[PDB]
């Protein structure tokens, strides 16, 4: 049974082809689809898609949605694969977790468009794609399994090119020391409040975030004698004992 092709919560079953293994004669990689929203600049007119192909990157999604565009007259404005986490190495950001700035869903690649009419045209096209794959398994709409997976994951013993990472960390240090000296100068230049309140600061401290986090992390001589109520309590002591 393949005619079951759409789930309860708007999920659009998207099957594709698989290539030829030398011993395998089938070939059902399954994806989901939605159309979700939020007013921020990374979730408006967007789509989930679940159960990703390995190294789903920008270029074969480019060619696949171009194939659908030239196939069944859908319009599409693709730009980038938003929040592509397939391996699981970019959840917690250590650099933002302990930095001054450059601060701030499992196998669900998100993808948004420019035109909501374009993403609705691809939505209707994809629902018809799901049911045409359900009807026939041989006149498929297709993302063929094109492989830049090889181009990024059979060559990983490569020496990273020396001049490239030279200029890369050259630019990284050249912006890091700039924003660092800017932050420290902003710290110990002069801080008056809205009213008159000069802020106490260290001799060689570096960040308002630093003094903020240390003020977050920083969240006797009585006498048993000498008073006449204490001679009252000690006469009570010296008559009870």
């Amino acid at each position: 049974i393949e005619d079951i092709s759409a789930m309860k919560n708007g999920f659009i079953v998207v099957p594709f082809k698989l290539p030829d293994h030398k011993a395998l004669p089938a070939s059902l990689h399954f994806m989901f689809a939605k159309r979700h929203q939020s007013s921020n600049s990374n979730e408006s007119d967007c789509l989930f898609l679940v159960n990703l192909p390995l190294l789903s990157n920008i270029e074969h999604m480019k060619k696949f949605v171009g194939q659908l565009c030239g196939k069944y007259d859908t319009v599409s404005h693709v730009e980038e694969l938003l929040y592509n986490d397939e391996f699981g190495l970019h959840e917690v950001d250590l650099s933002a977790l302990t930095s001054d700035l450059m601060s701030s869903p499992r196998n669900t690649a998100l993808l948004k468009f420019v035109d909501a009419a374009s993403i609705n045209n691809c939505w209707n096209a994809l629902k018809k794609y799901s049911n045409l794959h359900a009807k026939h398994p041989n006149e498929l709409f297709e993302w063929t399994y094109t492989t830049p997976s090889f181009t990024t994951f059979v060559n990983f013993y490569k020496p990273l090119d020396i001049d490239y990472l030279k200029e890369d960390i050259h630019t990284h240090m050249a912006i890091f020391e700039q924003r660092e000296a800017q932050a420290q100068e902003d710290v110990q230049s002069s801080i008056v409040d809205e009213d008159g309140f000069t802020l106490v600061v260290g001799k060689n401290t570096k960040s308002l975030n630093s003094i903020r986090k240390k003020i977050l992390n920083k969240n006797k001589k009585a006498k048993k004698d000498f008073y006449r109520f204490q001679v009252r309590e000690r006469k009570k002591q010296e008559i009870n004992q």
Binding site: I4, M7, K8, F11, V13, L18, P19, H21, K22, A23, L24, A26, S27, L28, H29, F30, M31, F32, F48, V50, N51, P53, L54, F87, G88, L89, H90, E91, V92, L94, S95, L97, T98, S99, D100, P105, R106, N107, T108, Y145, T147, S149, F153, V154, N155, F156, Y157, K158, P159, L160, I162, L165, K166, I169, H172, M173, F176, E180, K213, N217
Partner: protein
């Protein structure tokens, strides 16, 4: 000082309630000695006619050797009703419910009227004893057959403690009057009269047999036939004195049966001879003194625990064999006399007997060692090891309580065929001091093994297997074809435990050269024949010695024992020892000059890369940075003698070819702040160091490689260098800042994101910080535990053939293999590779997780871990796995001095992998105790155990890589692997991806992609496990128990999806296995589902 006696009372409640099986059988032996009471006399009738009288009967007479021919048997062949006594085991209350069977002691000493003053010569009184036995068993068999209780009994002629001089009458019961649900073998024994002759014949310097080589064995045997009644008088009077004896000796017999020391005999070639009443005798002898001034060793003021401790202290600090032995007389102080009789000795002057002459010199030697070893593990106040000292029967296996084994098969043919089938002695003077053929070959073979090895082994034990003290009613003797002879042994166990520092030393040294060739050089040249000669040395000494051509597969201990066997005791017998060579080609043999002739205890490859590393060290210190080097420290597996290739130059194909070296600069407070910026500054320093390296010394070459063995830091590279001596080193910069950066990242992270960043910091600590003291400690200790690098290398190849290295880490495998070394109790340290490896697997099959931590201190023999740190380690273990209920995600707990947390290396491994390891260990020890060691046994121990658990892929890269990894493939020619050996560096360094394998890290990537659906494994030592061509690799996968069937579709299922219903989904297993092969499209060849 509190809970060991609670353990003692646990042993008491384990051993007790003997009444249900002492009362009924004391009633049954009461009926039995009533039957012996109504057995009447049988007067003097001649020997030559009782031959014919017993001829056509079923009772053919047993005999001591040889059969008494009537030319001199003019003895009084009487029979009288003897004296009954119910003594010993069931009268002094030392009965363990063993499923093998406790013994019994019923005494029938001979009456006064059937001997003479000079009856004690030429063992025809023992012939009298044997025919006495023959009539008693004939009379008893017809009486019990007319009393019709033969339906469950069977009588048998045995030997009293494996001695042919003393046969006994043992009764074994089988399936109202039957006793078969527990201990067997109720035996009766006759003895000699109490006091007959003045003690000159009782002295161990007697021989009245014909032409004086004395007979101390025989005048001890007849004296032990007679005078073991004063000793139980002594036992009973100390029993009436005080009470701790019964529990002290059930403890003693318990420990001695765990050590394999029963009181049969070690003169006949078996481990034993020492036993429970000997233990009683030495406790009560140390009662009234023990010192040289008879200072009281043992008071009953302290109970059995300190009685036992004082006993083991006296036996370990007071020699008996060669210098000093105990003296005591039962009729009465006890002291310590000064010399030794070259045999286990203690003198009892009221008997003139030598009670410890039932076992031999090597058996006493190994028992004094066991005294010292259990004393060492008993006197310590650190931990509690009562189950380590008692409750593990070490006697179960041969190669576990011993270190290696030889089996001499001697096909001598016949007793007459001796003179051309074996080169040993054949004399009156040897048959007068040795009972039989196995006895003289046993004493000769232990003396020639002792003289052949000397300072080459710790201890030798000889044990003839196929021996049995069992011969039937109808038969006169053990009438048994014992595989090429008719003597009571099949073949000779030669079990060796070795001083491991002189196994593969290829020259043993006799005395030097005087002109007058004295007797020591004489007996050296006689014992060594044509082979040994006198040589010069670099010192210039002229000394007697012999060359031992060391091979890899063969330890030279087997060659020297092969010559010491085939030169002296036989000239055509053969030696069986195939286990050592059976795994030594399972070791990988590197492409080194004369590497077959190199030992396995040679470390010249590791020293070669250490020399290359040191010249690199000098050329990286003699240059100028903007921030100087504080220290570099190698941390590599080769720098701690662990890597599976014994590291040959240019050997790229091993994935741990690149050793890793941490390097740290001085504490400059100028550093970048955030973590990506600081690791990029470390890359900047590595850019500068390789820039000046290629500037000045271009004979080294280098490149950069990203590392992702720490999670979530995207910009951490390592500097890899290729050294023109032919090696490859990773360099990782450490700073003083990364530790506090990770700690404050931990502090300011979101509170539901804490333990993952804690896991990142734990991986950092394991990779950078504690790894240095790890490799320092065990590299320092490997030169004291010399078999460590071979046992870890064979363990790691076993673990990759059984496919676990994709989850477990190599330091954890290293810690599991150091565990039997730094704590080998109750055993020895392993002087051989097999003993090490099966000690590892026996321990980890024993080992649990729920109530079992693993504390070890990697210390030198004889800085340790004290009580406070021990309790802190156990307490954080305790709260750790009461927070963790059963080991849901934390399985092992390996805690050292260098990591009292213990969770550093055990983290990350899945529960199926850990349970698979423990199950494989239990399967291996099951196979060991069932099938025995064999070539197919070892091949089954290195079978893949592929199990067809859901997934098999078969992978072959387009080239073979064993000539490139440098392990030679046992070829007939070395130029065949030399012209394919990669003794050149590749110029464009990108080609190492196709000169190596991608399988381990691609299985890593796929595992972290499918972390909650299926766990994957790949053979990461490619043709080390993959046959001979060097190409076969597998990919396997165990599916989770969650995905047994279709599940309700969600967004957090996060798996490979197939809606088989509108609500239910399952894997597209063919599509994802196809995508695995699609990623490995050039790597994959074959695939099998299920």
């Amino acid at each position: 000082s509190n809970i060991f006696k609670l353990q003692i009372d646990e042993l008491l409640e384990q051993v007790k309630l003997k009444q249900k099986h002492v009362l009924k059988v004391e009633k049954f032996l009461h009926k039995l000695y009533d039957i012996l009471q109504e057995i009447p006399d049988w007067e003097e009738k001649s020997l030559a006619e009782v031959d014919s009288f017993f001829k056509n009967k079923i009772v053919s007479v047993p005999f001591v050797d040889p059969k008494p021919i009537p030319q001199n048997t003019n003895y009084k062949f009487n029979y009288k009703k003897p004296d009954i006594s119910l003594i010993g085991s069931f009268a002094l209350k030392a009965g363990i419910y063993q499923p093998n069977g406790s013994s019994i002691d019923t005494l029938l000493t001979m009456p006064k009227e059937l001997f003479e003053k000079k009856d004690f010569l030429n063992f025809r009184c023992l012939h009298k004893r044997s025919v006495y036995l023959a009539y008693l068993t004939h009379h008893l068999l017809i009486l019990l057959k007319k009393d019709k209780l033969d339906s469950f009994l069977q009588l048998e002629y045995s030997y009293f403690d494996n001695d042919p001089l003393l046969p006994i009458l043992r009764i074994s019961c089988s399936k109202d009057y039957n006793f078969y649900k527990t201990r067997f073998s109720i035996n009766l024994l006759i003895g000699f009269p109490y006091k007959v002759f003045e003690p000159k014949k009782l002295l161990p310097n007697r021989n009245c047999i014909r032409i004086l080589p004395a007979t101390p064995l025989y005048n001890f045997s007849v004296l032990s036939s007679s005078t073991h009644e004063n000793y139980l008088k002594y036992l009973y009077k100390t029993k009436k004195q005080t009470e701790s004896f019964v529990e002290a000796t059930v403890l003693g017999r318990l420990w001695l049966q765990q050590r394999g020391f029963s009181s049969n005999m070690s003169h006949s070639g078996s481990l034993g001879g020492f036993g429970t009443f000997e233990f009683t005798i030495l406790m009560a002898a140390l009662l009234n003194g023990g010192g040289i001034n008879s200072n009281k060793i043992l008071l009953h003021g302290f109970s059995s625990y300190q009685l036992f401790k004082g006993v083991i202290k006296y036996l370990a600090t007071m020699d008996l064999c060669h210098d000093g032995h105990l003296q005591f007389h039962s009729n009465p102080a006890s002291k310590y006399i000064d010399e030794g009789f070259q045999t286990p000795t203690l003198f009892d002057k009221s008997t003139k007997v030598n009670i410890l002459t039932k076992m031999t010199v090597s058996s006493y030697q190994i028992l004094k060692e066991y005294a010292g070893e259990t004393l060492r593990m008993l006197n310590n106040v650190v931990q509690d090891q009562f189950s380590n000292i008692f409750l593990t029967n070490i006697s179960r296996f041969d190669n576990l309580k011993y270190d290696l084994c030889y089996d001499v098969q001697l096909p001598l043919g016949k007793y007459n065929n001796l003179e051309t089938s074996l080169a040993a002695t054949f004399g009156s003077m040897e048959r007068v001091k040795f009972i039989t053929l196995e006895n003289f070959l046993a004493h000769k073979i232990t003396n020639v093994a002792r003289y052949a090895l000397g300072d080459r082994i710790k201890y030798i034990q000889i044990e003839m297997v196929g021996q049995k003290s069992d011969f039937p009613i109808t038969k006169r003797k053990v009438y048994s074809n014992t595989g090429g002879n008719h003597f009571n042994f099949d073949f000779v166990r030669v079990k060796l435990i070795v001083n491991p520092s002189e196994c593969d030393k290829l020259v043993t040294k006799g005395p030097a050269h005087s002109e007058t060739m004295s007797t020591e050089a004489a007996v050296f040249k006689n014992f060594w024949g044509i082979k040994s000669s006198l040589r010069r040395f670099k010192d210039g000494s002229i000394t007697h010695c012999c060359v031992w051509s060391t091979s890899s597969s063969e330890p030279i201990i087997s060659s020297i024992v092969n010559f010491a066997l085939q030169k002296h005791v036989s000239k055509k017998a053969q030696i069986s020892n195939e286990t050592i060579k059976k795994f030594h080609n399972f070791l990988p043999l590197p492409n080194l000059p004369s590497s077959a002739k190199t030992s396995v205890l040679n470390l010249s490859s590791f020293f070669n890369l250490k020399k290359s590393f040191d010249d690199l060290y000098k050329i990286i210190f003699q240059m100028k940075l903007p921030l100087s080097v504080k220290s570099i420290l190698p941390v590599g597996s080769a720098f701690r003698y662990t890597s599976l290739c014994q590291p040959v130059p240019f050997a790229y194909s091993d994935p741990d070819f690149f050793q890793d070296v941490i390097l740290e600069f001085e504490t400059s407070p100028k550093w970048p702040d955030e973590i990506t910026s600081l690791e990029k500054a470390k890359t900047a320093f590595l850019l500068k160091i390789q820039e000046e390296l290629s500037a000045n010394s271009s004979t080294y070459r280098s490149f950069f490689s990203r590392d992702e063995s720490i999670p979530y830091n995207l910009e951490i590279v390592t500097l890899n260098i290729l050294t023109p001596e032919g090696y490859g080193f990773k360099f990782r910069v450490l700073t003083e800042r990364d530790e506090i950066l990770y700690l404050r990242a931990i502090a300011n992270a979101r509170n539901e994101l804490k333990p993952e960043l804690e896991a990142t910091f734990l991986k950092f600590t394991a990779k950078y910080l504690a790894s240095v003291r790890h490799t320092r400690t065990l590299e320092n200790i490997s030169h004291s535990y010399q078999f460590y690098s071979p046992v870890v290398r064979l363990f790691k190849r076993w673990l990759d053939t059984h496919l676990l290295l994709g989850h477990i880490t190599d330091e954890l495998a290293e810690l599991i293999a150091i565990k039997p070394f730094v704590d080998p109790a109750p055993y020895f340290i392993p002087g051989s590779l097999e003993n090490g490896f099966l000690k590892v697997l026996k321990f980890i099959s024993q080992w649990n997780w729920k109530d079992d931590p693993l504390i070890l201190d990697l210390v030198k023999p004889e800085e340790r871990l004290t009580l406070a740190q021990y309790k802190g380690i156990q307490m954080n273990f305790t709260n750790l796995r009461n927070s963790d209920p059963n080991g849901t995600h934390l399985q092992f707990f390996v805690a050292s001095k260098n990591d009292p947390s213990g969770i550093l290396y055990s983290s990350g491994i899945p529960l199926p992998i850990a349970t698979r390891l423990t199950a494989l260990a239990k399967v291996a020890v099951n196979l060991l105790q069932t099938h025995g060691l064999n070539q197919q046994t070892i091949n089954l121990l290195f079978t893949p155990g592929l199990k067809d658990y859901d997934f098999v892929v078969d992978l072959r890269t387009p080239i073979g890589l064993k000539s490139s990894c440098g392990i030679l493939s046992a070829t007939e020619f070395k130029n065949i692997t030399n012209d394919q050996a990669p003794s050149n560096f590749p110029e464009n360094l990108n080609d190492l991806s196709e000169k190596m394998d991608p399988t381990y890290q691609l299985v890593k990537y796929l595992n972290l992609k499918y972390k909650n659906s299926l766990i994957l494994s790949s053979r990461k030592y490619i043709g080390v496990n993959g046959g001979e061509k060097g190409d076969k690799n597998v990919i396997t996968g165990l599916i989770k128990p969650l995905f047994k069937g279709a599940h309700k579709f969600r967004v957090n299922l996060d798996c490979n999806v197939k809606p088989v219903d509108d609500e239910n989904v399952i894997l597209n297993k063919e599509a994802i296995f196809h995508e695995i092969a699609a990623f490995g499209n050039d790597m994959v060849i074959n695939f099998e589902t299920d």
